[PDB]
Design a protein around this ligand. Structure first.
Ligand SMILES: OC[C@H]1O[C@@](CO)(O[C@H]2O[C@H](CO)[C@@H](O)[C@H](O)[C@H]2O)[C@@H](O)[C@@H]1O
Ligand SMILES: OC[C@H]1O[C@@](CO)(O[C@H]2O[C@H](CO)[C@@H](O)[C@H](O)[C@H]2O)[C@@H](O)[C@@H]1O
Ligand SMILES: OC[C@H]1O[C@@](CO)(O[C@H]2O[C@H](CO)[C@@H](O)[C@H](O)[C@H]2O)[C@@H](O)[C@@H]1O
Ligand SMILES: O=N[O-]
Ligand SMILES: O=N[O-]
Ligand SMILES: O=N[O-]
Ligand SMILES: [Cu+2]
Ligand SMILES: [Cu+2]
Ligand SMILES: [Cu+2]
Ligand SMILES: [Cu+2]
Ligand SMILES: [Cu+2]
Ligand SMILES: [Cu+2]
Lengths: 334, 334, 334
């Protein structure tokens, strides 16, 4: 019935983002994505704590899907028979049927195909929402990601100037609720079903045990640090499907920030810390001016340093002494 | 002394709103409202948990009061002798005397009349504030509502285009603190005074037991779902007098949103989730494009699904397959 | 190497702010500040609870530093030998080296001199950040303040009109984590090092025991109330280095508010309550219209009334009956 060209997208694991154009001369197309649900026990910290995760495509967050305004997004959702629970998908970018959730419920062994038109620009959460108390449980178990709907002319600053990024990263923040036993050690479970009772009791007290980026403490540090060069404009897309976050780039700024994540609104300029409302994604762009290590954190510093919510950037380039200099190194007080 | 025409308003229970004009050719008037305090034990969940509520006009939230910029709002506050405590009222829309709280303290058996000029447009909280530790207790017991001060020319989009709503609903979100006994069951009390000690201990730990719309789990579901039709522009006013909230219309958007609630500022466009700061009201308008059920939630999904914060909309009209379609129904994986 | 005029600033204790110009015809200069770290046991409430504080210049918050865009800020940080721990400083206003933290780590007995160029306007947090789990601990122990970077032409409303304040106050909000013993009394400790284990356990549960302005319950009340006169435009700078806050002036408004704190963005108008994201500072200006007492609170009313987060303003001038009047004093119900 709908006769537009079709384009397949090969999704990639976060924090990377599949190849895409910013400004395009393509007209609308049907863009085809596939997500396969995987339920799996994973390690979430350096002490070896385990967690019953539920994921789109094996990752937390699920992959970033990128399209342009007026595209039709056609998603094949697959729930293999090796899973134990029904799942679905709700796109905050979509209109009707609970974001698609009412049309995508699939038992283990089934798949479904949903199409929605991308009428609203910005970055948006997607997540599983199977019904009732299951909705929060599936989301905080890892079943969330994001989709970016770009204007066809790319991003702008709201004063008529183009904003082009040199690279984009997707940082998905996940609040996790891992119960402790009487001795005070984290509990491990054999199945998501068995984790449910204890996990729900903890969830309703609203305090996470862990808050992590990309699924694990230290995921985006060391070999897996984010990278840039002095002079590069980097877009950081940040989502949180359940709980607020307050991103901050230590040693940098948000030069242009859409904290509510929606490109019909002009970005704010020159922020120190921005706010991602639980159930939303936002985006910040920064042109790096200095080399060295930066940390990207939520600026609840207890969550950042003690609960897991810290990423690093390693930046190459030349140090600018005009911007900052150590006038006198540490020395004994006169 | 002040010689303007007087107009009486018959308040209605939320989520409905008394009849009013958007744009008006009336000039300023003295608009007269009456609020009668009622203290009462109420049921707040489907399990039969009870709660010592304190309310304006018998409802949680108190009713929405609607006026226009430059009107004088004259409120008669009544504290009948059947109540046990002093009460007052603080309007965030008003200027001076702690929002009127310093001029409205009334013991059981008394009434008072306050007038304030509506110099600031937007939606604003009102709440009881009797002094000291009583202030939070009365507010989280249900003594809060909102008032909407419209521009005389009605709402606009900040680019010169009128925004007219077809209907308005008021959703008041209430964080409730109900203590549990040693067995882990919710406690019941014979009076608000007796609930005070246990309730205050719990309040200071900052985690609610319930978060509800319109006073009870499921208040705005079933027979009492909100309603609309495809093509209707609906304004949703949302208040939270004590704690943040992150409203989201599942399957829709906020087409025009004043998250800080104040109409001197242009609305933001095309939001997925917005943020209501504790101690404020905000407003979002959406033109429905699809029929069916929508849920309106705070997008802390634990609060929404497990603690009570979910409303429904039932929308009539024709399904738009261009916006969304199930391409292939659930079927066995090839 | 850098040959600009030098200007020394004598810092003053909050909530006051050192003398400065708004709009200036001075060009860039090197502005020189000195901060001396002090670790000390302090009383934080009227019951006599003690707390192991760590401070810049002996105060919580540290003093407000005021400069203009394009100034170079040269800070001497001193860690006297009477202290027990290493410390450093991170300015959110600065670019590179973790905001200066990577260049300013000093042991007891040492000092360091850092210079950074003020390229971004607004109000910004500064705080200690010595590494790892120490980062949150030093911040919630009191090691944070703010710096205001003004445009050279002073503030404006984003529609071409100047906004000039008659006075400025700095309100620093501090979340404190004081553990309790088995009887339920607050614990006291002999050193910050000894407070660390118990304090960290409590911090990771994310619920503060106290939330205070200017370091103590009631700090900004009584003799130490903030003051103004009817007709005065007052700027209130508010910071929170770790946790969100929702400032509200009871009986007033935010006439012009930069909630994200950055003067490259136009202020919002006519707010009731605004939001300071943890890890940021914001600023609100209000022209007082009515005399009397006002309270300035975070509008989580439990935090304000029960945990310590309330300041007062005493305002002199003539009462305006047009804005508000008690039409009928409290009287028996007919
Ligand atoms: O950045 C969005 C912001 O910019 C304005 C112009 O100030 O509109 C720009 O962006 C629109 C959406 O991308 C474009 O269609 C428009 O052509 C462009 O000027 C604002 O209207 C908008 O809020
Ligand atoms: O939506 C408010 C926003 O729109 C602007 C114009 O961009 O002003 C409009 O609204 C004012 C308040 O309602 C009107 O008085 C004005 O006439 C109208 O243009 C902005 O100034 C304002 O922030
Ligand atoms: O208040 C900042 C806001 O105002 C605008 C004009 O609408 O720019 C003003 O402020 C700039 C920064 O101070 C000035 O450089 C400019 O000259 C002045 O018009 C907006 O661009 C800005 O976002
Ligand atoms: O050991 N179980 O709580
Ligand atoms: O049974 N009372 O806690
Ligand atoms: O008495 N100590 O927990
Ligand atoms: Cu699922
Ligand atoms: Cu959702
Ligand atoms: Cu009351
Ligand atoms: Cu209030
Ligand atoms: Cu320190
Ligand atoms: Cu910081």
């Amino acid at each position: 019935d709908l006769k537009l060209p079709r384009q397949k997208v090969e999704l990639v694991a976060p924090p990377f983002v599949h190849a895409h154009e910013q400004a395009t001369k393509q007209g609308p197309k049907i863009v085809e994505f596939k997500l396969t649900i995987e339920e799996k026990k994973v390690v979430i910290d350096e002490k070896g704590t385990t967690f019953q995760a539920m994921t789109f495509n094996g990752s937390m967050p699920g992959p970033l899907m990128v399209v342009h305004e007026g595209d039709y997004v056609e998603t094949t959702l697959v729930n293999p028979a090796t899973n134990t629970m029904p799942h679905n998908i709700d796109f905050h970018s979509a209109t009707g049927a609970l974001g698609g959730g009412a049309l995508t419920l699939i038992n283990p062994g089934e798949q479904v195909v949903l199409r929605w038109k991308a009428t609203k620009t910005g970055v948006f959460v997607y997540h599983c929402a199977p019904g009732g108390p299951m909705i929060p449980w599936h989301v905080v178990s890892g079943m969330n990601g994001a989709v970016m709907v770009l204007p066809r002319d790319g991003l702008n600053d709201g004063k008529g100037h183009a904003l082009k990024y040199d690279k984009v990263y997707y940082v998905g923040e996940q609040d996790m609720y891992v119960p402790r036993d009487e001795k005070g050690n984290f509990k491990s479970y054999d199945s998501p079903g068995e984790a449910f009772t204890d996990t729900e009791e903890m969830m309703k007290k609203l305090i996470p045990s862990h808050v992590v980026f990309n699924g694990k403490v230290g995921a985006l540090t060391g070999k897996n640090a984010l990278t840039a060069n002095v002079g590069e404009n980097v877009l950081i897309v940040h989502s949180q499907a359940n709980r607020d976050s307050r991103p901050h780039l230590i040693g940098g700024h948000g030069d242009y920030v859409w904290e509510t994540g929606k490109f019909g609104n002009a970005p704010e300029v020159g922020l120190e810390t921005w706010f991602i409302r639980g159930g939303s994604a936002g985006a910040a762009m920064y042109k790096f001016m200095q080399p060295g290590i930066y940390a990207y954190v939520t600026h609840n510093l207890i969550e950042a340093a003690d609960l897991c919510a810290t990423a690093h950037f390693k930046v190459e380039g030349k140090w600018n002494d005009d911007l900052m200099t150590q006038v006198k190194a540490p020395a004994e007080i006169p």
